[PDB]
Design an enzyme around this catalytic site. Structure first.
Site, PDB file in Angstrom:
ATOM      1  N   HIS B  12      42.119 115.403  17.147  1.00 58.02           N
ATOM      2  CA  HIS B  12      43.162 114.449  16.779  1.00 58.02           C
ATOM      3  C   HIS B  12      42.761 112.994  16.606  1.00 58.02           C
ATOM      4  O   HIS B  12      43.602 112.192  16.214  1.00 58.02           O
ATOM      5  CB  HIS B  12      44.330 114.535  17.763  1.00 58.02           C
ATOM      6  CG  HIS B  12      44.942 115.892  17.839  1.00 58.02           C
ATOM      7  ND1 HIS B  12      45.575 116.485  16.770  1.00 58.02           N
ATOM      8  CD2 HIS B  12      44.991 116.791  18.852  1.00 58.02           C
ATOM      9  CE1 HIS B  12      46.001 117.686  17.123  1.00 58.02           C
ATOM     10  NE2 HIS B  12      45.658 117.896  18.383  1.00 58.02           N
ATOM     11  N   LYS B  41      20.671 114.329   9.867  1.00 57.70           N
ATOM     12  CA  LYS B  41      19.796 114.402   8.700  1.00 57.70           C
ATOM     13  C   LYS B  41      19.763 113.007   8.070  1.00 57.70           C
ATOM     14  O   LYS B  41      20.812 112.439   7.770  1.00 57.70           O
ATOM     15  CB  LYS B  41      20.270 115.453   7.698  1.00 57.70           C
ATOM     16  CG  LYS B  41      19.256 115.741   6.596  1.00 57.70           C
ATOM     17  CD  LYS B  41      19.689 116.893   5.718  1.00 57.70           C
ATOM     18  CE  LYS B  41      18.684 117.155   4.601  1.00 57.70           C
ATOM     19  NZ  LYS B  41      19.183 118.210   3.656  1.00 57.70           N
ATOM     20  N   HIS B 119      16.019 124.282  -2.755  1.00 58.69           N
ATOM     21  CA  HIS B 119      15.677 123.008  -2.122  1.00 58.69           C
ATOM     22  C   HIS B 119      15.967 121.891  -3.104  1.00 58.69           C
ATOM     23  O   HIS B 119      15.808 122.057  -4.309  1.00 58.69           O
ATOM     24  CB  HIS B 119      14.196 123.010  -1.693  1.00 58.69           C
ATOM     25  CG  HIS B 119      13.645 121.666  -1.313  1.00 58.69           C
ATOM     26  ND1 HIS B 119      12.671 121.025  -2.052  1.00 58.69           N
ATOM     27  CD2 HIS B 119      13.909 120.855  -0.260  1.00 58.69           C
ATOM     28  CE1 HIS B 119      12.371 119.875  -1.478  1.00 58.69           C
ATOM     29  NE2 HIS B 119      13.109 119.745  -0.392  1.00 58.69           N
ATOM     30  N   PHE B 120      16.446 120.768  -2.581  1.00 57.66           N
ATOM     31  CA  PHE B 120      16.598 119.571  -3.383  1.00 57.66           C
ATOM     32  C   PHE B 120      15.376 118.702  -3.131  1.00 57.66           C
ATOM     33  O   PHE B 120      15.162 118.231  -2.013  1.00 57.66           O
ATOM     34  CB  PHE B 120      17.876 118.827  -3.002  1.00 57.66           C
ATOM     35  CG  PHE B 120      18.232 117.723  -3.949  1.00 57.66           C
ATOM     36  CD1 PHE B 120      17.625 116.471  -3.833  1.00 57.66           C
ATOM     37  CD2 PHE B 120      19.153 117.942  -4.971  1.00 57.66           C
ATOM     38  CE1 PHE B 120      17.942 115.450  -4.719  1.00 57.66           C
ATOM     39  CE2 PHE B 120      19.481 116.927  -5.863  1.00 57.66           C
ATOM     40  CZ  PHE B 120      18.879 115.681  -5.741  1.00 57.66           C
ATOM     41  N   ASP B 121      14.575 118.497  -4.171  1.00 59.39           N
ATOM     42  CA  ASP B 121      13.312 117.795  -4.014  1.00 59.39           C
ATOM     43  C   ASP B 121      13.439 116.285  -4.169  1.00 59.39           C
ATOM     44  O   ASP B 121      12.888 115.523  -3.365  1.00 59.39           O
ATOM     45  CB  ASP B 121      12.278 118.350  -4.996  1.00 59.39           C
ATOM     46  CG  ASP B 121      10.861 118.140  -4.523  1.00 59.39           C
ATOM     47  OD1 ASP B 121      10.540 118.576  -3.395  1.00 59.39           O
ATOM     48  OD2 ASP B 121      10.067 117.554  -5.280  1.00 59.39           O
TER      49      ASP B 121
END
Ligand SMILES: O=c1ccn([C@@H]2O[C@H](COP(=O)(O)OP(=O)(O)O)[C@@H](O)[C@H]2O)c(=O)[nH]1
Ligand SMILES: O=c1ccn([C@@H]2O[C@H](COP(=O)(O)OP(=O)(O)O)[C@@H](O)[C@H]2O)c(=O)[nH]1
Lengths: 124, 124
Positions: B12, B41, B119-121
């Site tokens: 809440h 991250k 994967h994002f490079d």
């Protein structure tokens, strides 16, 4: 184990929304705060006042709890809150919510020592 | 066991002035998409294009991944993306992110069968 493909979708894909989608607040917050697991919690309110201000409601106006318990308290003033309500189109595990910005007095149940908010009862 | 006080805070409380602001997108998303469990991250990109368009990258311009792996691919066109970067003030479990929207080419690693992004490079 989560597939690499599914992990990429989770970590990197947001095809259905954008940061300017303010209506998306409840979708993301209900997810963030773990209220979309097992089932979609149908109604939930988030309060945007300080924790101190919400804690202070426990020392404010004594009122009847909706469930008949006798530990509810109403805020002395209106508060900025957001109601998150599951839409008619919403279906688990894709929990969809309408976001409603409201400024109303809140009623919380208080418990513990010191007495602090433990349940959100209603807005009035 | 989660205390009642903590449960109320989780369910809440969202103290702040502009909870649904676009500036809060990364805070909400990084939490919802499980990239703030255990640690924050530090950098993460979300892609606002269709899954088909992102999958299509796996048949486009081959580039070497930053880490020397050889299964990366660059999008032929720019894509609408959001970068989430930890602020200076950010410290676990209070992860805090700066949200920035840009249009850039993306570079992803593709794997599996069918070959899909895993994967994002980088963005360029
Ligand atoms: O305005 C409201 C009404 C209910 N709830 C939450 O919804 C739950 C129960 O829902 P509700 O009382 O509306 O339905 P019922 O209890 O009758 O099933 C409570 O635990 C509250 O946390 C809320 O957050 N804001
Ligand atoms: O533009 C970027 C760069 C990095 N990442 C993510 O951040 C992680 C690692 O960042 P990077 O390789 O760029 O630097 P490193 O942490 O390895 O030093 C990767 O797994 C990606 O998921 C991202 O989402 N967008």
């Amino acid at each position: 184990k989560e597939s690499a493909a599914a992990k990429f979708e989770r970590q990197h894909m947001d095809s259905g929304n954008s940061p300017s989608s303010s209506s998306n607040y409840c979708n993301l917050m209900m997810c963030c705060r773990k209220m979309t697991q097992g089932k979609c919690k149908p109604v939930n309110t988030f309060v945007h006042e300080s924790l101190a201000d919400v804690k202070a409601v426990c020392s404010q106006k004594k009122v009847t709890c909706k469930n008949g318990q006798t530990n509810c308290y109403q805020s002395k003033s209106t508060m900025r809150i957001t109601d998150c309500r599951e839409t008619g189109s919403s279906k688990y595990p894709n929990c969809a919510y309408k976001t409603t910005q409201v400024e109303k007095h809140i009623i919380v149940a208080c418990g513990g020592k010191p007495s602090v908010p433990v349940h959100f009862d209603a807005s009035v």
